[model samples]
Structure formats: C-alpha cells, structure tokens
Target: MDTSKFWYKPHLSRDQAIALLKDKDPGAFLIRDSHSFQGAYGLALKVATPPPSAQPWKGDPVEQLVRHFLIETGPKGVKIKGCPSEPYFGSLSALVSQHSISPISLPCCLRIPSK
Candidate 1:
C-alpha cells in the first residue's frame, strides 16, 4: 500500500507499521490523510489493510486499531473499562476538548504506554 503524504513528516517504519497491524492496535498507527476520515465527525476509523495472507485470522483491522488507539489515548485518570464505539465519541470528545484545541488535526500521533 502507498503511504500517504501526511506520513512524510514522521515516516513510519515498515516494522512499525507491521507491528501496528500485528498487534491490531489503533494507537500505534497514526491517521494521516483525508481518506482516513470517511464520514461525519470524520470518523472513518483508520486501519491498516492487511496483506492477503494476513487477512484470514484477523477480523476488521480498522475496528481493532480504533479500539487500541482510544485505549491508549484515554485520559490518565479515566479507566478504559471497555472498547470504544460510535457512542463513545462523547467521551473522546470531552477528553480531547480538555486536552487540545484542535482534536481533529491530521497526523494525530498517539503514544502507547509501555506495558
């Protein structure tokens, strides 16, 4: 797959991209282009389309990535008891409003804390 121009700044390593896919963690993958958002609220759910060989075992990569990303970026005080969904936008919005001015900014990178 062709990497997006937005990824030029912080070019993600192939290993990093692979790891993000292997781990199925959204937080590990950064959303970097207009295509990344497909609907209102720009909530297209960024995901790495896995290679054909990797597709069978895994389900929706987008869902996995979004869940992982939200879990990692959630407020420190707030415990992410479960996976996030469309309804969880309110919570994510509230958190982003408190933390940053432009929550929808592109190339939004998330740091997954070391386990």
Candidate 2:
C-alpha cells in the first residue's frame, strides 16, 4: 500500500542498506536504486544466518544476511528476475506486495521496511 513511503530509499548505498537490516528479522526489505543499471531499482532483503558463537549469551542477535535483487522496468510492467513465473507488475508497489506474500525469487518474503 502506501507503506512504500517507508521502504523506498532512493539514496542508500549497499553498505548503508546492510546497516539498516543488520539487527532486523529475516523478511525485512527495502527498495533502492540500481546504481549499476540506471533507472532500474533493487531489492535489499534480509534472511537468516547462524548466530555467532557466544556462550550463555543473554542478548542473542539474529545473524545478518542481506540479499539483493534487481527490479527491471518494461513497457509491459515491472518485474524481477530469477523467478519461474516472471509475471510483470503494474508498479513498484505491486511487485513488492506480490513478493511480500510469496517471496517469489527472494530468500524470504518482504515483511519489514528498513525504515
């Protein structure tokens, strides 16, 4: 929905995205620009990883594992690669909402925004 306002980060770098997702849960996600591909967008999603070795730790942190995906735009619609369906979406929000439900090609569904 209008929630994209919170996750659409136009100026965040790869490293910056990681910092935002570092302590978040597995399924958190954000949308950023694809610097390598002008005009394209990218998806930065967090997935689970084994926590570091710590004996009797009271504050266990969820390991940070962020994955990036490219969001390509076409006259037909918006789309993401590495998916079997490869269905085109009408807008960035639509594409995000679909993956938020099924994860599609992502490691996990988009649940939380980086913001």
Candidate 3:
C-alpha cells in the first residue's frame, strides 16, 4: 500500500516530525498528529490500512476526521494557549518517557483532564 497518499502534514514541518516517528517506530511513519498528550501536544503513528471507498486516496475517513477534530477542535484546539507552565511540562514528559511513549522535542503545556 502506498502510505504517502494518506500523509497529512502537521502543524510543524513534516521532516522533523517524520524523523521523530522513524526514530520511535521504524515501521511506522506519522500520517496524522494524534494529539493524545496534553490535548494536542502528542503524535500518532501512521499505519497502512485499506483505503476508504469514498476517499480512495486517503485511508479511513473516520479516523482522519477523528484526528482532524482532535487537532482542530479538541482541548488544545489549534493554538496552544492557557496551558500550564513549568514542572507540569517536564513532569508530563517524564511520565510519557517512563511509559516508553515517544519523547517530545517541542515544549507543550498540559491540559488537565476534566474529572
């Protein structure tokens, strides 16, 4: 399967993010930003799946839309504003690292999960 077709350029340049993905998982490249951590500060791996019927060139449209919403309207919401500073950032990084999640090269603010 041609993975390039599903490539969704992220807010940051593709090269840096792709390099990071390659480092994290050689088999997986970044197709979309998962924005799992601290709202929209995290990344997701790109997996080759069957193409969607409606979107022949792209992968699953549902997944793509879900990611779009996460990146665009989720907690982080395009811009990273009103995020926590200091120890939170460092602490979250450490937590992710400890869990074997990919380390973040860029600093990000934490969005406390609502209870």
Candidate 4:
C-alpha cells in the first residue's frame, strides 16, 4: 500500500485526470476518487488513438482519448468493472502492478503514472 509514487491521486477530479492523460502515451493512467460513487475509485487511462479510417476528415486535432473504469471495493475486494473472473487485488498497488504487466481487461496496459 505504499503510494509514494503519487499514482493514487485522491483529490484529483475527473476533469483534471482527463487533462493530465490526454497528451500522454496510451498506457499512461491515474487512479482517482470516483466523481459520483462513494468508496469507489476511478481508473483514468489514455486510450489509444483511433485509426485513421475511423477519424473524421475535418475535426479537432487527433488526441488520445481518456476513459474511466470504475474500481469497486467492498467485502469481496477490489475488482475493475466488466471482469467477473479477474482476481481481486489486495491493494491498489497490486491492481496497478497486475495491469502494468499486462492490459488485462483494459484497452491498454498501465504504464506511466500521471504526474
């Protein structure tokens, strides 16, 4: 549970998280307090850029997208949404470590921790 790396940003809002990750690599991410859900966490990650074929011909410059995944915590433990069979990590660091090594249920692997 050592968060000396400053990756666990409890006071960071969703808007701030988006601003931090929008320009970062696809694997860059942050864990923040859920905007609406009490006792829950938000996994804000910079998703991979869309394929050129999927982009609009004329629009805002291409920027990596940011997506939030709810991290639910309870008696059962911490599990990211949409994965029922994934192991419940003992701590936030454990969850981050798991995803850092592999994408797991996420769109991209967890890499740089937002500054």
Candidate 5:
C-alpha cells in the first residue's frame, strides 16, 4: 500500500459520480439520504474487480445499460438519470457496506436463500 496515492475530496452527487464512472473516471460518490440528520447513502464504484489473478471476482462492473429499476432509486438527493439498476450482479447491501451485506450475499453480488 502506498500513501502517496491517497485521494480524498468532498463527496460527489450520485449524478456526477455515475457520470464519472460512465466516463472511466472514478471517485468516491456519496448519495444523499433524507433520514437521521442526513440519512444513509450506499457506496459503490465502477471497479474492475480483481484481475485474472483474482478469482471469484473478475472484470469491471459497469452499470452501462439503461433499464427500468424495480427499486428505481434510493441514492438520496442526487438525481441519477438513466442509470443501470446494477452494474453487475452485486447486492444492494453490499453497496452500502462491505461488512454488513446480508449473510446470504456473495462477493460477486448474488443473493441466496437463507435457510
């Protein structure tokens, strides 16, 4: 890990963040929430998962398609226009926090039945 490569700044609106991902420019995006003092926002990125060297995860997850989402939106205040419901097969819980994903979620973003 190299501290020289550290990057930080004010969070980007969901619309702007998605635009960056769509353009191949990546950043930490903060979606607005209306609950609590500011509510909760999910965090995800257009990341190209671990390379061939990294199994289980591969290739970049791009929400490159325009489709209707059953949930549609939850990114709080940001107005995301024409965003894919999911870049890949990952979970919504996975998006918000890595550690807190429902136990039934896979790293690849799939969900399974809890028995």
Candidate 6:
C-alpha cells in the first residue's frame, strides 16, 4: 500500500501533532475499533476530519481519551487489549502522578522534555 504524506512527520511534537489534528475534516473523523497506531491514526483522522461537531463518537469522550492515551504513549505503542489495563493503568497511574496537569488524562508529552 502507498501511505505517502499520511505520516509526513511521524515524529511530530505533541503540539505539532495536536495542531495538525486540529486542522479539521468534514466526515465522521474517528474509527475507534482499531489497533495501536491505527487507533491514533484514527484519532488524528477524527480530529482533522468531519470536525468535533459531527463526531460519530459523541458523548463518550472517553473514547477520545483512550485514543489520546495511546498516542501519548506512541513511543511504547499499545497492544490489542492484549495485556489488558492492570499493569498498563498502573504505569499510567504512576505517569499520572508524575504528570503535572489538570484534566488528569491529558497527554504527558504536552510538557517540554527535561534532561
């Protein structure tokens, strides 16, 4: 398959990815039933497409949060509910504790990296 430009900057910074995602599309932007990268790709697809007002996954913003959680962990990536949430959420909890943000579930990369 030819997936050119679809991931022009796979290494985009958090804001850059968010900015790109905010560009807006005019269809049903999200496709939640997907695996790791596809889930994120789908989330970004939703964010830039159809726009929020027409989201198919309306009401349960948790789906979006789940996608964001996956994307935020882009470096580590996700399994297909393969390992389930225990250890993952535990690690997530520690990360959340380490996190310094409101809305709790916000992506950790939103913060600048430190040495």
Tell me the tens digit of each residue's lDDT in model 4 across 1-115.
2233555688988778877778555667777878667777888777777555655545444333666678877777777876766577776667878887867667677775432
Higher TM-score: candidate 2 or 5?
2
lDDT of 6 by residue, 46-111 (tens): 222233554544445333422233422334542213223423322433443333343233332222
> Against the true structure, whose TM-score is highest?
2
lDDT of 2 at 84: 69
Compare candidates 2 and 4 on TM-score and give the better one. Answer: 2
How many clashing residue pairs, candidate 2?
0
Clashing pairs in 3: none
lDDT, residue 71, model 5: 17
**Runs in model 5 with CA error above 4 Å?**
1-11, 25-39, 47-115
lDDT of 3 by residue, 1-115 (tens): 3254343454544445545543442234333454455444433333233235445345434343221112223323243223342123233234333223432322222111211
lDDT of 2 at 9: 83
Q: List, residue by residue over 81-105, the lDDT tens digit for candidate 2.
A: 6566678888877878777786677
Which pairs of residues have clashing backbones in candidate 5? 90-109
Question: In candidate 2, which residue pairs get closer than 3 Å at backbone N, Cα or C atoms, i.e. clash?
Answer: none
Candidate 1, 16-89: lDDT as tens digits: 54445456444333332222223212111224343355444355543333422222232333312333422233
lDDT of each: 0.33, 0.70, 0.35, 0.70, 0.31, 0.33
Q: What global local distance difference test value does model 2 have?
A: 0.70
Task: Specify the highest-lDDT model's number.
Answer: 2
- What value does the lDDT take at residue 44 in candidate 1? 19
Predicted structure 1, TM vs. truth: 0.22
